[PDB]
Design a protein around this ligand. Structure first.
Ligand SMILES: Cc1cc2nc3c(=O)[nH]c(=O)nc-3n(C[C@H](O)[C@H](O)[C@H](O)COP(=O)(O)OP(=O)(O)OC[C@H]3O[C@@H](n4cnc5c(N)ncnc54)[C@H](O)[C@@H]3O)c2cc1C
Ligand code: HEM
Ligand code: HEM
Ligand code: HEM
Ligand code: SF4
Ligand code: SF4
Ligand code: F3S
Ligand code: F3S
Ligand code: FES
Ligand code: NA
Lengths: 238, 114, 470, 105, 105, 114, 105, 119
């Protein structure tokens, strides 16, 4: 559809902070397209745009765009969900992130927060098995909701508790990683991670907002992680 | 900046706001108990101060905010006891029922006023 | 003027085959750089709806001899099996070594690896829909474990080539810094892969700007059968060919006669690096199996390669002037034709006359089409004048890369008078097995084509002849 | 630490729940309160001890409560510190006034 | 920690020893106790302060005592937690009742 | 399971059992002091309740268990002060003398009863 | 720890400053004190609550004070421990006597 | 001594604005003559529990030298011991110093920062 577009700012290095220039293009009605195709079509007229896209199938958290106030995967979220009755579709960049480029903003704080949880196995060295590990699939059927966090930063930027204190908290997915490497029976180092997390008020900084689950792009359960890890932690330090 | 759908935020903020006002409530009620019990000379005085419609509005508000706080507190209690199950429908139904019983307890304060 | 830093190992690509390489160079210990274009997880490898394939033992018996039998009957008997030898003999070791990293692979009720069936006769495993997703995530988590210093969100535009003909590093142009640097290092492993961007409809993603052949060919590095191109059944999916190499890692060139010689200072693994273990129809996940086990071999074969060639020199710091003048030519164009239209016409020509059907008359027609377009390509205008950062800039460069790959495939359509393997022809539907039992070879500077012979799988087993496909 | 706070909050909320139940239950069953009955229902043991317990528990609870508020919102450190001082003196004054007003009857 | 507990137990046992000595010594030297003498020996300063000190020390001592019992024997965690709550409210109620019964005389 | 010679176990258990019963003793005695001191109307009442032979049995038991607890507590105190030496003979002689003085203090309670 | 001590000392010194100001200010504005006026200025709420608060804060302050003295000077450990016991019982006896002497008026 | 976890924000040389160096000119010349250390009234009675003035000048040097990022661990390792606070602000050492160095300044900023963390 022949459409006007209105975005946050198409060049950050310009002296001014706000820039709501008029995007304009004439699009067709007889063939559906997705938001990235809008980007593709525009990029040859308004040249100074930029964006971080990878896969056109939405599997590697490339473009978790929060447009019009609602977040989603830019390769899952078409335009009709933006051209509702009224005008002024809004596709501004993501929240609370450094203005270092137009839409590929920095995630150093975010990826670092993920890093501080030691998201990797560790074996002191005992070799109970010889050739292959020993695990009953009763674990795997309850592990199917942790190892696909695509790091799209939808839930993390969408946690009310995390906002006010950006550095003291740990975020939902930063806890999904902990829980993954926790109830994966192939480790035995629960206590050190637990009482290292116990110290910081990060686990409890949660007020059980639970909005993130609806907002999640993969339909993952961080609330579940927040539940079992609280239960276990309480059990230890009581 | 704007998200337009903070369903949990309103439920949550209403907890710390009510806490912050109840924290000064408890002081107002300590004052009221003090000035009342001292002798008969104050009791009617105290009821006299229990009289004005500004004061009645306040005290009903004190007790309504208190009821909201108590109820949400119980939800935080039971939900973290593990006695309540987690899902979207549970959250929205808890919001509904808690709000209804909050208005119910509010009405109790109104009955006390009348 | 350009700041330079001395290194022992750099890698062109981050995930997939690259994660393996950098991890093995990390456990080596000296130094292990990690350059890429996108943040590791975002790599094309993450699209992973197909499981790793390696025989570890189901309830029934499965030997590596059956592994070779099926992986060669699949390849339609076109390539050598020395690499198939190494694969079928070292696969299980590497897959279990990865499974000890806590890699979340789905098990069976007893607690053993899950196995499923695919084309041909008993081992095509899988973890979940996200098998390679877990693969990459575990390799990234081990990258965190050994604190390997990733340099993400950058680019590699071309390599270095001195007088005696060696490679001692790579240039870089970024998006967080956007200023060219030089990482000098005897080991430069082109392990990026992918070109499908030069076509309209395909499975591949847009981050694949077709570079692993771009820098190679432009620098003047030869290639082997850039037309072995699998179209997933009817969407294009894989580039069977790519840069040449051996099971131990080093790339190969040829003299005026055509004898294969070790190239000084170059390496390659991953879907780019071809040993034709995939051939007509790749075995299910033998590019995946490539990036895992061939990369494990690329790691275990580091000291053997650096010992024969080391302590070399730079081209009097005058070869960086090659890519420097490329970027100067970039500092030349003010106006002209939009690169978008060039790419449009090229894409059109190639998907029109170099897919599954390549008809001789129309073959030469598309040849001269893409040739005249190549000639006129030089004057291309530039949509963005931005100083700090954009996307367009890299877009600009990717043109001078993308097209080049297609070139090779086109040329090879003039070098194969049959329908051999995936390669098919209307004027030649059959598959002759007397003349071209050998690989092709595109010579860059002469832009010509020659042949390269292949061995009949003598390593440890009595060889078998090419059977009839029945 | 943090689980310390968690447990104190939950437990003292338990005691507070029982309190408000009992106290506003008496308000319910008041039936024409009088000075006589008012001082009657206060001069007991049960009421006296339970009210002092209530004020003490409010201290130990609201302390941690406002600590959480003023560690999440009020950013400057000198401010937040003096603010917590004011609030903690407020609570201890609450309990001592409670004393002087219940053990005078 | 654990030495904290150790030292509190030993010290408060010292104060308790001195108490029981003094109190049951008065029982010894009673010599035909009477209401008059009973209220006499209680209305003092010394007796009042020493009895409040005794009940407070019993709080601070028996708390840790039952903590040790219920961390050694009662295995399930929810149980032991609510049990400690009951016992701690028991002690604080002990001391407050003590108040209402000694500062009434 | 059975060991047949837990000489220390009996000495030790008698410590936590006595503690557990004294913990409820202190509450019974707070009650008794409360109901007594309130006025003369209660004092004889209190002594009346100090009267029954069930109650007398209890109170003597309260004070005997208390004496056992005090004595063993002192042993734990002095033995850990380093003021007492460690050996088998010291342990058995401490058991003997502590038990004798426990019965002695018990007799004191009996004297109070009579 | 140590910053805990630091902050408690500074804060309770703040409350103590305000106290001494108010109390010796009343001594200033005395103007021919009398038993009548003396019991007058004491029987208030304000004076009662502020004096109990003062004694409590002196407890929580001088405790840490003498802890610092007896961890810097008196070297033998058994000595210093029993000395701190004597001093802590001194402070708690101070506050309880304060009770019995202000909530008697 | 310095410690870099390993991040390489620069490539060839470190990045530091001389605004630091003009306020670092009073820490890296402690000649260890033990004048101030033996001259601290607070340090005497407890010789082992304290840390001394210059022992804190070193900490402050490796603290406000912007070329590190490991402030918190050193801070809360120093916070534990009552060594920082064992000071009674005697300040005599400054006069007694042979180089005319400021340990009091170190005792000031490090107390400020520490207070800021553990409050
Ligand atoms: C549904 C499905 C089915 C599949 N079926 C099969 C099958 O049957 N057989 C099979 O073998 N495989 C199969 N695969 C796997 C897949 O198709 C590829 O074969 C495999 O992912 C190749 O990975 P790689 O490591 O070789 O390349 P990659 O790891 O993707 O190489 C790219 C790397 O280089 C980096 N990079 C990107 N651009 C540049 C640049 N310009 N310069 C430098 N570095 C750059 C990227 O960030 C990344 O680190 C399947 C996958 C899917 C999703
Ligand atoms: C009656 C006087 C009460 C006072 C003075 C008081 C004090 C407070 C305050 C000020 C807060 C907000 C600050 C904070 O803790 O984050 C709070 C939180 C809380 N209150 Fe209370 N409260 C009272 C009653 C109750 C009752 C009866 C309950 C019943 C369960 C309760 C349960 C809770 C819980 C669970 C929290 C923590 C939840 C949260 O973080 O918001 N409160 N309390
Ligand atoms: C008079 C009321 C008393 C009460 C309410 C009380 C409380 C308790 C209780 C319940 C225990 C058992 C739980 C435990 O600590 O493991 C205990 C243990 C102990 N008691 Fe007491 N006690 C009292 C008197 C005394 C006295 C007078 C002493 C004299 C020294 C004493 C010394 C000890 C010691 C040393 C212990 C720890 C030894 C052990 O672990 O069993 N107690 N206290
Ligand atoms: C009125 C009764 C007071 C008592 C019983 C008391 C108690 C003590 C004692 C015994 C010391 C020395 C032990 C030590 O802390 O190292 C001390 C130190 C201190 N006093 Fe007080 N004090 C009182 C008044 C005040 C007042 C009104 C202030 C006003 C600010 C104050 C400020 C301080 C400070 C800052 C220290 C620590 C400085 C140092 O280490 O010497 N004191 N306190
Ligand atoms: S919301 Fe879910 S999918 Fe998105 S980043 Fe968080 S965990 Fe990953
Ligand atoms: S007084 Fe100054 S010069 Fe002397 S040792 Fe101490 S810091 Fe160094
Ligand atoms: S931090 Fe809040 S947003 Fe959800 S995941 Fe935890 S309740
Ligand atoms: S310990 Fe004392 S001597 Fe000066 S440097 Fe600190 S005030
Ligand atoms: S484009 Fe890679 S995730 Fe959507
Ligand atoms: Na290729």
């Amino acid at each position: 559809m022949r459409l006007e577009f209105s975005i946050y700012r198409y060049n950050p290095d310009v002296d001014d902070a706000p820039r709501m220039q008029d995007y304009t293009l004439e699009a067709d009605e007889g063939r559906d397209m997705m938001l990235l195709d809008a980007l593709i079509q525009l990029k040859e007229k308004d040249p100074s745009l930029s964006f971080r896209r990878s896969c056109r199938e939405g599997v590697c958290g490339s473009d978790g765009l929060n447009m019009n106030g609602k977040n989603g995967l830019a390769c899952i979220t078409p335009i009709s969900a933006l051209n509702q009755p009224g005008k002024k579709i809004v596709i501004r960049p993501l929240p609370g992130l450094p203005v270092i480029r137009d839409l590929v903003v920095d995630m150093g704080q975010f990826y670092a927060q993920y890093e501080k949880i030691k998201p990797y196995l560790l074996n002191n060295g005992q070799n109970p098995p010889a050739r292959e590990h020993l695990q009953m699939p009763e674990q795997r059927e309850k592990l199917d909701g942790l190892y696909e966090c695509i790091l799209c930063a939808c839930c993390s930027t969408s946690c009310p508790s995390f906002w006010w204190n950006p550095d003291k908290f740990i975020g939902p997915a930063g806890l999904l990683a902990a829980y993954r490497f926790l109830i994966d029976s192939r480790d035995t180092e629960t206590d050190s991670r637990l009482d290292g997390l116990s110290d910081a008020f990060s686990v409890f900084r949660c007020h059980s907002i639970m909005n993130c689950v609806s907002v999640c792009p993969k339909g993952l359960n961080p609330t579940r992680a927040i539940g079992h890890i609280k239960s276990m932690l309480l059990q230890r330090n009581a | 900046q704007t998200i337009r759908f903070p369903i949990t935020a309103i439920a949550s903020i209403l907890h710390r706001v009510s806490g912050v006002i109840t924290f000064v409530a408890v002081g107002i009620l300590l004052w009221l108990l003090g000035t009342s019990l001292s002798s008969p000379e104050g009791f009617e005085q105290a009821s006299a101060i229990m009289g004005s419609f500004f004061v009645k509005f306040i005290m009903w508000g004190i007790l309504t905010a208190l009821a909201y706080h108590v109820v949400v507190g119980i939800r935080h209690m039971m939900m973290d006891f593990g006695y309540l199950e987690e899902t979207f429908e549970a959250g929205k139904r808890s919001a509904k029922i808690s709000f209804v019983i909050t208005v119910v307890l509010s009405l109790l304060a109104g009955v006390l006023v009348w | 003027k350009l700041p330079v830093r001395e290194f022992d190992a750099v890698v062109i690509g981050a995930g997939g085959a690259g994660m393996r390489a950098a991890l093995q160079i990390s456990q080596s210990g000296q130094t292990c750089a990690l350059l890429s274009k996108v943040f590791p997880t975002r790599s094309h490898t993450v699209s992973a709806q197909g499981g790793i394939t390696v025989a570890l033992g189901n309830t029934h018996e499965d030997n590596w001899e059956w592994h070779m039998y099926d992986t060669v009957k699949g390849s339609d008997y076109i390539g050598d099996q020395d690499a198939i030898e190494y694969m079928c003999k070292t696969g299980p070791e590497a897959i279990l070594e990865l499974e000890h990293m806590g890699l979340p692979f789905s098990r069976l009720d007893d607690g053993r690896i899950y196995q499923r069936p695919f084309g041909g006769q008993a081992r095509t495993a899988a973890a979940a829909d996200r098998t390679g997703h877990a693969l990459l995530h575990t390799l990234y988590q081990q990258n965190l474990k050994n604190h390997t210093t990733i340099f993400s969100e950058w680019y590699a535009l071309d390599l270095v080539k001195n007088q005696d003909g060696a490679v001692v590093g790579c240039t870089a142009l970024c998006i967080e810094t956007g200023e060219v640097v030089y990482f000098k290092a005897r080991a430069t492993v082109l392990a990026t892969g992918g070109a499908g961007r030069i076509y309209q409809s395909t499975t591949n993603a847009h981050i694949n700007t077709g570079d692993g052949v771009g820098m190679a060919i432009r620098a003047g590095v030869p290639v082997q059968d850039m037309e072995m191109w699998q179209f997933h059944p009817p969407t294009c999916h894989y580039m069977m060919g790519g840069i040449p190499t051996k099971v131990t890692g080093q790339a190969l060139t040829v003299n005026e006669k055509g004898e294969d010689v070790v190239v000084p200072g170059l390496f390659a693994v991953g879907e780019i690096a071809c040993v034709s273990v995939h051939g007509a129809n790749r075995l299910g996940g033998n590019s995946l199996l490539d990036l895992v086990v061939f990369g494990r071999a690329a790691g275990l074969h580091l000291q053997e390669s650096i010992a024969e060639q080391g302590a070399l020199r730079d081209a009097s710091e005058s070869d960086v002037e090659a890519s420097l003048d490329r970027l100067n030519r970039w500092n030349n164009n003010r106006n002209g034709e939009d690169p978008v239209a060039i790419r449009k016409a090229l894409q059109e020509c190639m998907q029109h006359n170099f897919s599954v059907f390549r008809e001789g008359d129309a073959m030469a027609k598309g040849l001269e089409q893409l040739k005249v377009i190549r000639e006129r390509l030089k004057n291309a205008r530039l949509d963005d004048t931005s100083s700090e950062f954009n996307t367009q800039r890299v877009e600009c460069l990717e043109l001078d890369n993308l097209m080049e790959t297609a070139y090779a495939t086109a040329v090879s359509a003039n070098f194969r008078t049959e329908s051999r393997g995936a390669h098919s022809r209307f004027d030649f539907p059959d598959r002759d097995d007397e003349n071209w039992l050998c690989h092709s070879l595109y010579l860059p500077e002469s832009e010509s084509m020659t042949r390269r012979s292949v061995n009949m799988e003598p390593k440890l087993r009595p060889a078998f002849p090419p059977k009839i496909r029945t | 630490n943090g689980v310390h706070d968690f447990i104190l909050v939950r437990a003292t909320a338990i005691v507070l729940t029982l309190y408000i139940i009992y106290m506003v239950g008496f308000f319910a069953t008041s039936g024409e309160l009088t000075y006589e009955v008012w001082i009657g229902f206060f001069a007991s043991a049960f009421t006296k001890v339970f009210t002092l317990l209530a004020l003490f528990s409010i201290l130990i609870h609201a302390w941690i409560g406002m600590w959480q508020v003023l560690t999440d919102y009020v950013k400057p450190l000198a401010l937040r510190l003096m603010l917590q001082l004011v609030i903690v003196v407020a609570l201890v004054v609450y309990v001592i006034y409670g004393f002087v007003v219940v053990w005078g009857v």
